Amino acid sequence: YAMNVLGNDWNKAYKKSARVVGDVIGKYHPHGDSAVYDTIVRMAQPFSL
DNA sequence: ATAAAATCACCCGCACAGATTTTTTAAAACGCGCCACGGGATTTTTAAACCGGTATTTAACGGTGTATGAATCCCGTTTTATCTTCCTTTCACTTTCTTTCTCCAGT
């Protein structure tokens, strides 16, 4: 949902991971930032999903 | 696989406190020498003991009114007895490197 709100679509330029992690932590997820990045990493590995 | 909490190396200038490192200086020492000083044997002089006597000067003695010495209670100081420790050391074990002995396929 946070990625959708920012307008980070599939046919546009990339965005840095730090900005997305900061938005997620500061607006929706009241937890640490390392776990969020680790979760994001797993969803982009071809050998995991 | 999601959560909670943590840790370390280096680069760039500048100012200063502390730790080696030369460098200089005053004290202690050695060798040689000479003359200042003290020992020994005469002359000389004077310090103190001794007789007086006199004229003071001190210490022992009897009342009052304190200042302090021994005793008690504490708390910082230093000694002494008492624990743990890291480097030296070998040493039996393990590991790892070097040479040798075959196999052995090919012709």
UniProtKB/Swiss-Prot annotation:
Q: Where in the cell is it found?
A: Cytoplasm
Q: What is the effect of changing S34W?
A: In PPA-18 and strains 233 and 227; quinolone-resistant
Describe the effect of D38V.
In strain: 202; partially quinolone-resistant
Coiled-coil stretches: none
Q: How does it assemble?
A: Heterotetramer, composed of two GyrA and two GyrB chains. In the heterotetramer, GyrA contains the active site tyrosine that forms a transient covalent intermediate with the DNA, while GyrB binds cofactors and catalyzes ATP hydrolysis. Can form a 2:2 complex with toxin CcdB in which GyrA is inactive; rejuvenation of GyrA(2)CcdB(2) is effected by CcdA.
**Entry comment, domain topic:** An N-terminal fragment (residues 1-523) can be reconstituted with GyrB, but the complex no longer has negative supercoiling or ATP-independent DNA relaxation activities, although it is capable of DNA cleavage; ATP-dependent relaxation is inhibited by novobiocin and non-hydrolyzable ATP analogs. The fragment has ATP-dependent DNA relaxation and 30-fold improved decatenation activities, unlike holoenzyme it preferentially binds supercoiled DNA. The C-terminal domain (CTD, approximately residues 535-841) contains 6 tandemly repeated subdomains known as blades, each of which is composed of a 4-stranded antiparallel beta-sheet. The blades form a circular-shaped beta-pinwheel fold arranged in a spiral around a screw axis, to which DNA probably binds, inducing strong positive superhelicity (about 0.8 links/protein).
Q: Which family does it belong to?
A: Belongs to the type II topoisomerase GyrA/ParC subunit family.
Stated role:
A type II topoisomerase that negatively supercoils closed circular double-stranded (ds) DNA in an ATP-dependent manner to maintain chromosomes in an underwound state. This makes better substrates for topoisomerase IV (ParC and ParE) which is the main enzyme that unlinks newly replicated chromosomes in E.coli. Gyrase catalyzes the interconversion of other topological isomers of dsDNA rings, including catenanes. Relaxes negatively supercoiled DNA in an ATP-independent manner.
Miscellaneous note, as given in the UniProt record, is:
When the enzyme transiently cleaves DNA a phosphotyrosine bond is formed between GyrA and DNA. In the presence of quinolones this intermediate can be trapped and is used as an indicator of drug toxicity. The enzyme-DNA intermediate is also the target of a number of topoisomerase poisons, including toxin CcdB. Few gyrases are as efficient as E.coli at forming negative supercoils. Not all organisms have 2 type II topoisomerases; in organisms with a single type II topoisomerase this enzyme also has to decatenate newly replicated chromosomes.
What is the official name of this protein in its record?
DNA gyrase subunit A
Species name: Escherichia coli (strain K12)
